[PDB]
Every structure is written in structure tokens, then in C-alpha cells.
Design a protein around this ligand. Sequence first.
Ligand SMILES: Cc1cc2nc3c(=O)[nH]c(=O)nc-3n(C[C@H](O)[C@H](O)[C@H](O)COP(=O)(O)O)c2cc1C
Ligand SMILES: Cc1cc2nc3c(=O)[nH]c(=O)nc-3n(C[C@H](O)[C@H](O)[C@H](O)COP(=O)(O)O)c2cc1C
Lengths: 109, 105
Amino acid sequence: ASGMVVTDAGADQPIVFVNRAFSTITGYAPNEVLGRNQRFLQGPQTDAATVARLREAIAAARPIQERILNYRKDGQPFWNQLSISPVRDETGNVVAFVGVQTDVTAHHH
Amino acid sequence: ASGMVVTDAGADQPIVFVNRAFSTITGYAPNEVLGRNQRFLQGPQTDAATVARLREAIAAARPIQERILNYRKDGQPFWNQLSISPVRDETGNVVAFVGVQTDVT
Ligand SMILES: Cc1cc2nc3c(=O)[nH]c(=O)nc-3n(C[C@H](O)[C@H](O)[C@H](O)COP(=O)(O)O)c2cc1C
Ligand SMILES: Cc1cc2nc3c(=O)[nH]c(=O)nc-3n(C[C@H](O)[C@H](O)[C@H](O)COP(=O)(O)O)c2cc1C
């Protein structure tokens, strides 16, 4: 099951919703992450160029997909196949962002 | 400001999230709508053909826009410029649906 998050469109994109699979993948309960920017999933081995691409895409409200190294609440690394899309109304205003997270790590084999 | 709703993909698409503007437009609070199908916004003069077009697009996970007559909690009719999009993972599975509601009355 893939994680899904909704964030606000404005002012550093606080989380406003996560699905159950997001908790399964990340180790965080919904109420521990509401109101926060998703960058808390990053850590020292996260690729800075990837993060830069995300930063520029979100600022421009452009869809973006990346495979990014993230970290569970407990510190356990996982590779995140991440897809972010703006949600627009019919006059083009960005209402929110949606993010999908798939854990693509081979954890056990 | 436009309303936004997120539903689950299966099991008759219950609401799992609404934004502030959804409540401004519709008169329902989040707690009144979570877990329900969005069709509670329809009423007596809602166009049946429009509803069927939405039904088919959701079943096929196809994006669709309709101008549909809906009803505020207090029963007042309003024209809903509605856009629905599937949310997919990178292998194509539908994870959720997103709806965007503009009151264009
Ligand atoms: C909807 C949404 C979901 C996001 N999900 C993730 C994620 O799962 N993992 C991640 O490392 N960053 C994720 N981000 C990106 C970070 O929140 C942040 O935008 C990125 O690190 C670039 O900003 P920064 O350089 O200011 O940290 C997400 C962003 C948005 C808008
Ligand atoms: C994300 C999402 C948002 C929806 N928003 C609305 C809405 O604002 N108004 C509406 O009349 N129907 C809306 N619908 C459509 C109804 O939920 C339902 O799918 C439609 O009436 C056709 O199905 P039915 O014949 O089973 O009722 C939405 C559906 C989804 C999946």
C-alpha cells in the first residue's frame, strides 16, 4: 500500500492529511506529523540535489517524481519512490499538494 | 476559495479529508461528512445524466469536470463546478480520489 499525504499549498506546505499506509511506511502517527513540512523524513544520507529538485518544483507548483532516501521515526532508512502533484481549481489556483510515497527498499532480501 | 475533498478509492469512496472552503461552500463541518459518499450533496433537481457521467468516470478512474446542482446543509441549491481526479502510485494503482468544488452559482 502506498502512503498518501495532502499539504497546504502556501507557507512551507504543512501536512493536513495522511493515510494509514503513510504511518505504516514512516512509523509516524498522523497527529505527530500534522502541521509539519515533510522534510522531517530526510536525513544525512539524503541526496541534496534531489532535495533541491523537490524544492524548485514545489515553489513553481510543478509535478515531480523522485526516488529519495528517507528515514522512519525510529531512524531506519528507506527508499521512497515519491510523486508530488499540485491540486488546482479550474481557474488554475493551487488549492493543495498531494504526495504519494512507496517504500521501494529491499529490506529483507 | 475552492473546496477540496479526498476520498478513498474503493468501498463507495468515503470522504477522508475536507478543507476549510468545503465547509464555507456546503455548510457541513468535517465531522458531519467524514466516512460518507459525496452524493449527499445532491438533491431533487440534480441532473441524473450528470450523476451517471460521474459514476462512470469514478468506476474507470478517469478525470472529469461537471457543473452539478448541489445543496447546502440548510437545503439551499448551489451550482458546483466540480473536478475529480484519481491519485495513483507510480505503478498505476489508484490510492484515492481528489475533488475540487467551486461555487459558480
Ligand atoms: C505533498 C508533499 C509531499 C512530500 N513528501 C515528501 C516525502 O515523502 N519525503 C521527502 O523527503 N520530502 C517530501 N516532500 C518535500 C519536502 O516537504 C520539501 O518540500 C523538500 O525537502 C524541499 O524543501 P526544502 O529544501 O526546503 O527542505 C513533500 C512535499 C510535498 C509538498
Ligand atoms: C473525490 C470525489 C468528490 C466528489 N464530489 C462531489 C460533489 O462535490 N458533488 C457531487 O454531487 N458529487 C460528488 N462526487 C460524486 C459522488 O460521490 C458519486 O460518485 C456520484 O453521485 C455518482 O455515483 P452514484 O450514482 O453512486 O451516486 C464526488 C466523488 C468523488 C470520488
